[PDB]
Amino acid sequence: TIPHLAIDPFSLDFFDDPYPDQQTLRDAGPVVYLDKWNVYGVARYAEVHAVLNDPTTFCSSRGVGLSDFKKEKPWRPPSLILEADPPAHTRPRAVLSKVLSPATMKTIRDGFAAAADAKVDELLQRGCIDAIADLAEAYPLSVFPDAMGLKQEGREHLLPYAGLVANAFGPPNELRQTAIERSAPHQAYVNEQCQRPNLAPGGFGACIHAFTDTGEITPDEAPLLVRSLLSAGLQETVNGIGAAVYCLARFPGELQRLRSDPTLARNAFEEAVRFESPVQTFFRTTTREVELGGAVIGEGEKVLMFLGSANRDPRRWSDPDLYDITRKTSGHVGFGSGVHMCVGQLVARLEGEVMLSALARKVAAIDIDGPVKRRFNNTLRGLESLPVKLTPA
Ligand code: HEM
Ligand SMILES: CC(C)(C)c1ccc(C(=O)O)cc1
Ligand SMILES: [Cl-]
Ligand SMILES: [Mg+2]
């Protein structure tokens, strides 16, 4: 009754162009079985949304990668938020929500915007730049480590550690094996920066450590909560900003609309997150037998959610394969949905908004002027290099 498919969603060919295979996955049925990895798959919006919003049945504490923590040891100690279920998830989640709060965003917004404007001004002096290394990577690196309270030394480990974490959610393929082989220096750096003395006053990390006396978390939980922000706090936003620049380069009519109304910056970024979904896929594990999309799934089964596919499902979206900066983007699952929905999304959206606002006000044209290079990662979609010429307004 459930269709079996041989598509490998973690193959290099799939990463190179996932969209035809994602249509095949959607159109085969609401629930498929992926014989390559012995997991269930859901690629339509409806089932992805349903799974995300039923955490009791589709749990996260057995891992949100392929590996089942009841069967195998996690490669690093489990995240106290991403890899926890309610109720243990609840109070650490509340702490991170209050650390990355609206009030915090108000404190840091003016500086984040000034740094975005300064970066675009600097790039316009060069003209021909790499929109990944010089913009999508450089701008978050110029604001987020400082906002964390990290020292200057060792920041070159941050993006490698993030890529390692994302690769480690995948199956035991070459991408994952090589990531773990290379992991030791990045992991050593990140774990050390999680200790209270290494996080500057007033930053996100210091605030986590200050939140250890309310009955929500204890002092020995704060290092791993800092680790969560150093796992997820940079590379995903880098990919989203790079995706937005890629979209504006490929769809010049949308850059023209954005220039005419820079208040579209926040939705232009949200639409880039829907369109390119930096986090492509994520797993749950069933805790009991469940009926989903007419299929009966037993206990202890891995369920692979295709977030990027859900964000391009024509059952949910009109013209899903168009980049439309005035689209009603509410409801996309690029940040997840439900109790685990990205706790850092205010930071991501702030960074993306103020960068796209700077581009909207300062740049007249964005022309690709060199070979575009994709980065392959088991979980993340993103570019390695995006040569562009920037024309000033
Ligand atoms: C465009 C950028 C980003 C994207 C696309 C993204 C995507 C996601 C997604 C899909 C989830 C849900 C995981 C799940 O349901 O299992 C998530 C959760 C999370 N994200 Fe983000 N994220 C981004 C930026 C950030 C930032 C800037 C931070 C930190 C400052 C962050 C920290 C986290 C954490 C800690 C969680 C776990 C929340 C929980 O389990 O309750 N992310 N993210
Ligand atoms: C952004 C993603 C969903 C990939 C993420 C979230 C949280 C963590 C953590 O370490 O808590 C790691 C990665
Ligand atoms: Cl680690
Ligand atoms: Mg090798």
The preferred substitution site among 82, 144, 277, 339 for testing ligand 2, maximizing ligand atoms within 8 Å of CB, is 82
> Tokens for 339?
């109790």
Three-state secondary structure call for residue 200: coil
d(CA 296, CA 15): 30
Residues in the chain, overall count: 393
Beta bridge partners of 292: 295
d(CA 134, CA 208): 31
Three-state secondary structure call for residue 309: helix
Q: Report the number of secondary-structure helices (H) and strands (E) in the chain.
A: 16, 13
Q: Which ligand is nearest to the CA of 52?
A: 1
For 181, counting Cβ atoms within 10 Å of its Cβ (0-12 exposed, 13-18 middle, 19+ buried), the class is exposed
Residue 141's nearest CA partner among 334, 351, 378 is 351
d(CA 232, CA 230): 6
d(CA 7, CA 123): 41
Beta strand residue intervals within 221-301, DSSP E: 281-286, 290-292, 295-297
What single-letter amino acid sits at 263?
A: T
**166 in ligand 2 pocket by Cβ < 6 Å?**
yes
Which residues have a Cβ under 8 Å from the Cβ of 75 and sit 6 or more positions away?
67, 168, 180
d(CA 74, CA 54): 23
Which residues have a Cβ under 8 Å from the Cβ of 285 and sit 6 or more positions away?
58, 59, 60, 62, 63, 68, 70, 300, 301, 302, 303
Task: Note residues around ion ligand 3 (Cβ under 5 angstroms).
Answer: 76, 187
Minimal-distance CA residue to ligand 2 atom 1: 232
Closest ligand 2 atom, CA of 279? 4
Is residue 48 within 8 A of residue 307, CB to CB? The reply is yes
- Chain CA centroid to CA 281, Å: 10
Q: Enumerate the domain spans of the chain.
A: 4-392
Three-state secondary structure call for residue 49: helix
**Ligand 1 center to residue 137 CA distance, Å?**
18
Which residues have a Cβ under 8 Å from the Cβ of 366 and sit 6 or more positions away?
131, 245, 248, 249, 252, 255, 359, 388, 389, 390, 391
Residue 306's nearest CA partner among 231, 241, 246, 381 is 381
Which residues have a Cβ under 8 Å from the Cβ of 92 and sit 6 or more positions away?
80, 81, 84, 216, 217, 221, 225
Question: For 195-203, which contacts have Cβ atoms below 8 Å and span 24 or more sequence positions?
Answer: 195/223, 196/222, 198/150, 198/151, 199/148, 199/149, 199/150, 199/226, 200/149, 200/150, 200/151, 201/149, 202/149, 203/146, 203/147, 203/148, 203/149, 203/150
For 298, counting Cβ atoms within 10 Å of its Cβ (0-12 exposed, 13-18 middle, 19+ buried), the class is exposed
> Tokens for 118?
């300064």
Residue 310's nearest CA partner among 331, 284, 283 is 331
Q: E strand or H helix at 13, and its extent?
A: helix 12-16
Residue 293's nearest CA partner among 51, 62, 30, 100 is 30
Annotated binding site: 89, 93, 284, 340, 342
CA 127 → CA 13, 186, 304, distances in Å?
33, 33, 42
**Ligand 4 center to residue 13 CA distance, Å?**
19
Residue 85, Cβ neighbours under 10 Å: how many?
17
Residue 13, Cβ neighbours under 10 Å: how many?
10
Closest ligand 1 atom, CA of 278? 5
**Ligand 1 center to residue 228 CA distance, Å?**
9
d(CA 372, CA 384): 8
**79 in ligand 2 pocket by Cβ < 6 Å?**
yes
**241 in ligand 2 pocket by Cβ < 6 Å?**
no
**229 in ligand 2 pocket by Cβ < 6 Å?**
no
d(CA 309, CA 21): 9
Beta strand residue intervals within the chain, DSSP E: 4-5, 32-34, 39-42, 58-59, 128-130, 281-286, 290-292, 295-297, 302-306, 363-368, 373-375, 382-385, 387-392
Q: Which ligand is nearest to the CA of 282?
A: 1
Minimal-distance CA residue to ligand 1 atom 36: 342
Burial 197-210 (b: 16+ CB within 10 A, else e): eebeeebbbbbbbb
> Tokens for 353?
């908004």
Annotated binding site for heme b: 89, 93, 284, 340, 342
What does R_g of the chain's alpha carbons equal in angstroms? Answer: 20
> Tokens for 98?
């209050």
Which residues have a Cβ under 8 Å from the Cβ of 107 and sit 6 or more positions away?
none
> Tokens for 268?
């232009």
**82 in ligand 2 pocket by Cβ < 6 Å?**
yes
Domain 4-392 superfamily per CATH? Cytochrome P450 (1.10.630.10)
Burial 215-249 (b: 16+ CB within 10 A, else e): eebeeebbbbbbbbbbbbbbbbbbbbbbbbbbbbb
Is residue 5 within 8 A of residue 32, CB to CB? The reply is yes
Which experimental approach was used here? X-ray
CA 123 → CA 190, 201, 329, distances in Å?
30, 31, 30
Burial 15-48 (b: 16+ CB within 10 A, else e): beebeebbeebbebbbbbbbeebebbbbbbbebb
Q: Which ligand is nearest to the CA of 166?
A: 2
Residue 118, Cβ neighbours under 10 Å: how many?
13
Three-state secondary structure call for residue 277: coil
**Ligand 3 center to residue 76 CA distance, Å?**
5
**Ligand 4 center to residue 179 CA distance, Å?**
9
Q: Which ligand is nearest to the CA of 181?
A: 4
Is residue 144 within 8 A of residue 205, CB to CB? The reply is no
Residue 58, φ and ψ in degrees, nearest 5: -105, 85
